[PDB]
Design an enzyme around this catalytic site. Structure first.
Site, PDB file in Angstrom:
ATOM      1  N   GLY A   1       0.817  -1.213   0.000  1.00 12.42           N
ATOM      2  CA  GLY A   1       0.000   0.000   0.000  1.00 12.42           C
ATOM      3  C   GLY A   1       0.848   1.259   0.000  1.00 12.42           C
ATOM      4  N   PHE A  60       1.003   3.477   2.277  1.00 11.57           N
ATOM      5  CA  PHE A  60       1.675   3.609   3.582  1.00 11.57           C
ATOM      6  C   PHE A  60       2.727   2.549   3.875  1.00 11.57           C
ATOM      7  CE2 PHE A  60      -0.498   7.165   5.499  1.00 11.57           C
ATOM      8  CZ  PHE A  60      -1.705   7.220   4.806  1.00 11.57           C
ATOM      9  N   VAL A 105       1.150  -4.660   3.158  1.00 12.88           N
ATOM     10  CA  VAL A 105      -0.024  -5.321   3.711  1.00 12.88           C
ATOM     11  C   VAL A 105       0.351  -6.795   3.861  1.00 12.88           C
ATOM     12  CG1 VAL A 105      -2.501  -5.738   3.468  1.00 12.88           C
ATOM     13  CG2 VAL A 105      -1.468  -3.679   2.445  1.00 12.88           C
ATOM     14  N   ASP A 124     -10.449   6.657  -4.318  1.00 13.73           N
ATOM     15  CA  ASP A 124      -9.455   5.728  -4.914  1.00 13.73           C
ATOM     16  C   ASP A 124     -10.087   4.470  -5.451  1.00 13.73           C
ATOM     17  OD1 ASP A 124      -6.928   4.827  -5.758  1.00 13.73           O
ATOM     18  OD2 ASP A 124      -6.132   4.704  -3.709  1.00 13.73           O
ATOM     19  N   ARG A 165      -8.195  -2.593  -8.771  1.00 14.72           N
ATOM     20  CA  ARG A 165      -7.128  -3.047  -7.855  1.00 14.72           C
ATOM     21  C   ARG A 165      -7.543  -2.824  -6.359  1.00 14.72           C
ATOM     22  NH1 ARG A 165      -5.496   1.846 -10.034  1.00 14.72           N
ATOM     23  NH2 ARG A 165      -5.775   3.505  -8.477  1.00 14.72           N
ATOM     24  N   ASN A 166      -8.482  -1.908  -6.154  1.00 14.96           N
ATOM     25  CA  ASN A 166      -9.000  -1.572  -4.820  1.00 14.96           C
ATOM     26  C   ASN A 166     -10.352  -2.165  -4.496  1.00 14.96           C
ATOM     27  OD1 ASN A 166      -6.663  -0.234  -4.260  1.00 14.96           O
ATOM     28  ND2 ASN A 166      -7.418   1.788  -4.844  1.00 14.96           N
ATOM     29  N   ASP A 199      -9.332  -0.493   0.645  1.00 16.97           N
ATOM     30  CA  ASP A 199      -8.348   0.595   0.474  1.00 16.97           C
ATOM     31  C   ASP A 199      -8.933   2.006   0.670  1.00 16.97           C
ATOM     32  OD1 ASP A 199      -7.460  -1.864  -1.335  1.00 16.97           O
ATOM     33  OD2 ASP A 199      -5.633  -0.858  -0.631  1.00 16.97           O
TER      34      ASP A 199
END
Ligand SMILES: C[C@@H]1CN(c2cccc(Nc3nc(N[C@@H]4CCCC[C@@H]4N)c(C#N)c4cn[nH]c(=O)c34)c2)C[C@H](C)O1
Length: 372
Positions: free
Chosen positions: A121, A123, A126, A234, A238-239, A252
């Site tokens: 991610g 940040f 995961v 977002d 993919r999310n 996400d």
């Protein structure tokens, strides 16, 4: 209660960030105890004059004190301060009033065993993981400490948002590990992985009815978020995540924002913004709304019926922005039914007001699915 070790205390929050501390302290004299990550000392944080004030708890000869008497534990010191209403320092005049307890979402590190990395991610990594008490499988989001302080303060935002939600098509929060570093957000592990990989891997095998059902699930999740005044910001294949039974869940939420009046004004400072998924007014003027999420949903529809193709492949982010301003839009995929593409085109109307609502999108997809 006072006899219990500090770590067990309801008002002990361990490694929570200063920014989270400000959220928690509402009223004058509201207080918590925490460990200062940097200094490796205990800190008593208290709301006074409208702002948190942080006092370092001194320790000597196994006694804990501020500027008065010392006590053999921090809980005994807190009880003394609360019970006597003595100011923490004579200079400050701060007086304790109410201990702010941890919420039900706080989780002990000991409860969790970290497994293999499953993705990356913004940040940080995961991981898959296990709750030790019942073998519940979880996804664990981490936050790299070398990230700029401004951005790291945003990490717990996804948890604060998701605490409020419960829906079949939204990923479920399990807890937050903030009693010590490293800080984690813990969620249900979604077995099938992300939707983009699913589309690319399962591919030719997928029936149109199946795809319509999955995007119908995404529309249901988005309708629920709109109802909660949540702007995701977002939304992309993919999310989205796929359960063992092919149900789709939106995930996400790191960029998501709650706005009572439906508009989030971006700082402008965002890095790695998903330009190809983002509506023109959001990029141009920082205006995010459910209508900008609707634009993203149109891209998600394109991703779904192209079976995971990458949008605007021949364009840079800046070229995509210019292309869109000129009226350019993504082409109809081969497998896309004419009616889905018409809905997709409405989602990409240039003016946000012209775009369909998520309820309309959900109903239209459902109606299309019934003839497939
Ligand atoms: C081989 C398979 C692979 N799997 C597999 C593969 C990809 C993703 C996931 N899962 C999750 N990915 C998340 N972010 C990802 C970031 C990177 C891009 C994809 C995602 N956007 C988030 C978030 N936020 C979550 C949140 N909650 N829960 C989740 O599961 C979860 C599982 C698990 C499976 C058991 O092994």
């Amino acid at each position: 209660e006072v006899q219990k070790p500090l770590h067990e205390q309801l008002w002990y929050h361990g490694a929570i960030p200063r920014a989270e501390v400000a959220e928690l302290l509402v009223h004058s004299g509201d207080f918590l105890v925490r460990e200062s990550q940097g200094k490796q000392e205990y800190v008593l944080s208290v709301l006074w004059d409208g702002l948190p004030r942080h006092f370092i708890i001194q320790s000597l000869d196994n006694l804990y004190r501020l500027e008065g008497e010392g006590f053999p534990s921090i809980p005994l010191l807190i009880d003394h301060l609360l019970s006597t209403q003595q100011p923490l320092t004579k200079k400050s005049g701060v007086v304790l009033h109410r201990a702010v307890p941890k919420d039900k979402w706080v989780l002990n590190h000991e409860d969790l065993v970290l497994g293999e990395q499953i993705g990356r991610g913004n940040f940080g990594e995961v991981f898959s993981g296990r709750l030790r008490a019942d073998n519940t499988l979880v996804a664990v989001k981490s936050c790299r400490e070398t990230l700029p302080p401004d951005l790291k303060a945003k990490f717990l935002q996804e948890a604060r948002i998701l605490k409020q939600y419960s829906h079949p098509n939204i990923v479920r929060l399990i807890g937050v590990c903030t009693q010590k570093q490293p800080i984690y957000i813990v969620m249900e592990l979604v077995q099938g992985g992300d939707f983009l990989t699913f589309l690319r891997t399962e591919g030719a095998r997928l029936r149109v009815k199946t795809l319509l059902e999955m995007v119908g699930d995404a529309a249901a999740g988005m309708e629920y978020l709109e109802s909660k005044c949540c702007i995701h910001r977002d939304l992309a294949a993919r999310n989205c995540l796929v359960t063992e039974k092919n149900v789709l869940k939106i995930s996400d939420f790191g960029m998501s924002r709650e706005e009572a009046d439906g508009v989030y004004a971006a700082s402008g400072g965002l890095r790695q913004v998903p330009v190809k998924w983002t509506a023109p007014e959001a990029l141009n003027y920082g205006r995010y709304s459910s209508e900008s999420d609707v634009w993203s949903f149109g891209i998600l529809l394109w991703e779904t019926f192209s079976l995971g193709a990458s949008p605007y492949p021949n364009l840079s982010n800046q070229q995509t922005r210019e292309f869109v301003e000129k009226g350019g839009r993504l082409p109809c995929p081969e497998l896309c039914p004419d009616a889905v593409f018409r809905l997709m085109e409405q989602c990409w109307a240039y003016e946000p007001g012209q775009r369909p609502s998520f309820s309309t999108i959900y109903q239209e997809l459902q109606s299309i699915r019934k003839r497939h």
